[PDB]
Ligand binder design. Structure first.
Ligand SMILES: CCOc1ccc2cc(-c3nn(CC4CCNCC4)c4ncnc(N)c34)ccc2c1
Length: 459
């Protein structure tokens, strides 16, 4: 009697979108235990290994326990997806916590990096490689200041092929080890990624950077970086030494995770008491806030355009479904039929229970209610506006957050940075601007930026 995910869990709400698919907050129908479930769509994500190999990894992952590694509880598979059920953590991404601080020192960075290396060391002893380690994969257990770090997605890269969509690979290029690019890699790739993360914590700038994905990769593959930024003068020699050892090009010469834990710098700056010399890295924290805001705005822009393309698709599809269901030809439908077509559209709505409630939120939202005969046309408008909300609202939020001086505007230099990170061709976005505002003087407000994005997705 093979078990069934939706027999055991109900979806509560969406937690986010991660590598390989959506993460949904779920609840055990008997025990009330809340859990974070990564749902991998077999249609969007191709497998690299065979079933046998994936089930063996899962079985191993369930038996490992470390304070800095996300705990996996359960694994299910049906016809259309894979479901990975883990512990839910509520502290958010590390860097989003870091940028809320007004003080940040080498002690804070060593506390951070020690946890990461401790989790990586443990996983490498069990022959699991992350490969895709980056800031987004570092979650905080809770919103508390003293919260432990939990690494997510350890081992998935081995069995599933990563999205080639830019909206999914923003800020992947900065962290990947050069041997991963060339195809022969081992567990040392996780030390390199960690090394990049440490460089960023102490300087707030990526060691390997450029205007677009491909320029960043060209820098990584060459392997050259420097410590000539002014804010490195404030950093201990010990920290730089550890960095050089983590960023060693040839993997066989690069320090192991385990050895990195024992390095003088980690031993010195994680002793809770001794502040022998501990200034605050003010420039770094502000660089990280700029870095983070840029990454988040580019991401939000791509998802805005993606949501706008989805809403074109689904509006037309839903209308054609309702049209054919309308046997009267009067343009009206009852509740069950609305539910039926919306389910037919299907392919957060993990069971029939999820669908009926979304429909009910819209029928309530249909302003005032006459029961029996519903104008299919207007239900479509409202169902779809609902779907785009999260993404337009999020777009404005990200715009406001990027605009740190509250100027209401972003410069064309800033647009170049954002569009380079979003991988929108240079000639393409300026042609678009020229058409939105024929009189602009090198800056756009929120509405203009939004109008630009619409034009860049064929509207
Ligand atoms: C081999 C383990 O297989 C699993 C199984 C379930 C997983 C669930 C989560 C998860 N994702 N998110 C949403 C975050 C929003 C911010 N961007 C990053 C994602 C989460 N938010 C809260 N808790 C979570 N657990 C997640 C991530 C990785 C998992 C890996």
């Amino acid at each position: 009697s093979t078990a069934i995910f939706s027999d055991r869990y109900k979806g509560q709400r969406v937690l986010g979108k991660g590598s390989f698919g959506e993460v949904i907050l779920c609840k055990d129908k008997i025990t009330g235990q809340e859990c974070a479930v990564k749902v991998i769509s077999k249609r969007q994500v191709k497998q690299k290994t065979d079933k046998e190999s994936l089930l063996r990894e899962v079985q191993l992952l369930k038996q490992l326990d470390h304070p800095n590694i996300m705990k996996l509880y359960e694994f299910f598979e049906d016809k259309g997806y894979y479901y990975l059920v883990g512990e839910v953590y509520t502290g958010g991404e590390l860097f989003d916590e870091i940028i809320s601080r007004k003080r940040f020192s080498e002690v804070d960075a060593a506390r951070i990096i020690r946890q990461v290396l401790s989790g990586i060391t443990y996983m490498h002893k069990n022959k699991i490689v992350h490969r895709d380690l980056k800031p987004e994969n570092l979650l905080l257990e809770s919103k508390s200041k003293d919260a432990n770090i939990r690494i997510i997605d350890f081992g998935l890269s081995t069995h599933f092929e990563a999205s080639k969509k830019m909206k999914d690979k923003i800020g992947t290029a900065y962290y990947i080890a050069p041997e991963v690019l060339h195809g022969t890699y081992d567990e040392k790739c996780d030390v390199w990624s960690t090394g990049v993360i440490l460089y960023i914590l102490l300087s707030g700038c990526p060691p390997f950077n450029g205007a677009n994905e491909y320029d960043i990769l060209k820098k990584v593959e060459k392997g050259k970086y420097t410590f000539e930024l002014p804010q490195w003068k404030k950093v201990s020699e010990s920290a730089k030494d550890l960095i050089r050892k983590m960023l060693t090009y040839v993997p066989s010469m690069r320090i192991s995770a385990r050895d990195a834990l024992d390095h003088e710098w980690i031993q010195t700056y994680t002793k809770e008491q001794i502040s022998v010399d501990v200034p605050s890295l003010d420039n770094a924290i502000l660089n990280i806030r700029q870095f983070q805001g840029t990454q988040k705005l580019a991401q939000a822009a791509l998802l805005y355009m993606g949501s706008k393309l989805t809403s074109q698709d689904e509006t037309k599809e839903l209308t054609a479904i309702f049209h054919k269901m309308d046997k009267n030809g009067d343009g009206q439908l009852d509740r069950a039929e609305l539910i039926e077509g919306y389910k037919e559209l299907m392919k957060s709505m993990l069971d029939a229970s999820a669908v009926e409630h979304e429909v009910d939120q819209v029928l309530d939202a249909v302003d005032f209610d006459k029961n029996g005969y519903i104008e299919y046309s207007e239900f479509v408008t409202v169902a779809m506006d609902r779907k785009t909300l999260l993404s337009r609202e999020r777009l404005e939020r990200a715009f406001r957050m990027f605009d740190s001086d509250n100027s209401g505007k972003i410069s064309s230099s800033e647009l170049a940075t954002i569009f380079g990170v979003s991988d929108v061709d240079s000639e393409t976005w300026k042609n678009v601007l020229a058409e939105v505002d024929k009189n602009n003087d090198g800056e756009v407000d929120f509405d203009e930026f939004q109008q630009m994005l619409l034009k860049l997705c064929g509207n």
